Amino acid sequence: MEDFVRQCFNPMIVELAEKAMKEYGEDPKIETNKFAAICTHLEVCFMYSDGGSKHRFEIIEGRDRIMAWTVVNSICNTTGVEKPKSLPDLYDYKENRFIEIGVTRREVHIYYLEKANKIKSEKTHIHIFSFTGEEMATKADYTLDEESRARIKTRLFTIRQEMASRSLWDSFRQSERA
Ligand SMILES: Cc1cn([C@H]2C[C@H](O)[C@@H](COP(=O)(O)O)O2)c(=O)[nH]c1=O
Ligand SMILES: [Mn+2]
Ligand SMILES: [Mn+2]
């Protein structure tokens, strides 16, 4: 699986993923499924950001903590939006709302509920994707056009197929915990 991650994700994504895990005291070489998951989430966040017009989104995920908060605080101060308790994934300039992106190895509804439970003060939009083409978003408001969403779902399905081709999917699929 380590070889797979290094092989299928671009080096910027891999470096960020390794940094995040090390920050929690985890070794990418050992907790490989987690490593793959972090990379997948990052890729989706980047793809989602590229979906709209130029300038539509601000990427929060993948930034160091100080910078991420600086962006969030700056957005809140200027637009007047309420400040989130935890860092969200992106900011949508057009709809003027923060977005939390979730990618799950389980089922979209359960993950959406788990995400919803964490936000509580839910002014943040939630969008969840699975590796099997399903998606779930707050109020069925999907934000992006179908073509954009299709591109993400396809990339995710492809990752699943590749993992499966290497006999890595069964373990990966079962590594997500409530
Ligand atoms: C906030 C956080 C996320 N993650 C992982 C879970 C996901 O695979 C990825 C993205 O998380 P997020 O969906 O909350 O943005 O980062 C952790 O391992 N520990 C953490 O504390
Ligand atoms: Mn995040
Ligand atoms: Mn997320």
Give the 3-state DSSP-derived string for 85-130, with helices as H, strands as E and coil as C. Answer: CCCCCEEECCCCEEEEEEEECCCHHHHHHHHHHHHCCCCCEEEEEE
Q: Which atom of ligand 1 is nearest to the CA of 34?
A: 8
- Any ligand 1 atom below 6 A from CB of 43: no
- Any ligand 1 atom below 6 A from CB of 38: yes
CA distance 89 to 71: 11
CA distance 87 to 61: 8
Residue type, 170: D
Centroid of chain to Cα 133:
15
CA distance 112 to 95: 20
Instruction: Say how many domains are in the chain.
Output: 1
CA distance 123 to 176: 26
Number of Cβ atoms within 10 Å of the Cβ of 84: 17
Resolution, Å (one decimal): 2.0
Do residues 159 and 166 touch, judged by C-beta distance below 8 A? no
* Ligand 3 center–CA 167 separation, angstroms: 26
Structure tokens at 162: 């590749």
Residue type, 14: V
CA distance 27 to 50: 30
State yes or no: is 83 an active-site residue: no
CATH code for the domain of 105: 3.40.91.90
**Quick one: which H or E segment has residue 137?**
strand 135-137
Q: Which atom of ligand 1 is nearest to the CA of 89?
A: 15
Task: State yes or no: 41 annotated in a binding site.
Answer: yes
CA distance 60 to 45: 9
Nearest alpha carbon, ligand 1 atom 6: 38
* Ligand 3 center–CA 175 separation, angstroms: 17
Q: How far is CA 110 from CA 1, 100, 133, 176, in A?
A: 26, 15, 15, 12
Nearest partner of 89 among 103, 78, 77, judged by Cα: 103
- Any ligand 1 atom below 6 A from CB of 99: no
CA distance 74 to 34: 31
Structure tokens at 26: 């985890």
Centroid of chain to Cα 40:
7
Do residues 45 and 62 touch, judged by C-beta distance below 8 A? yes
Residue 161, domain extent: 1-178
CA distance 4 to 28: 12
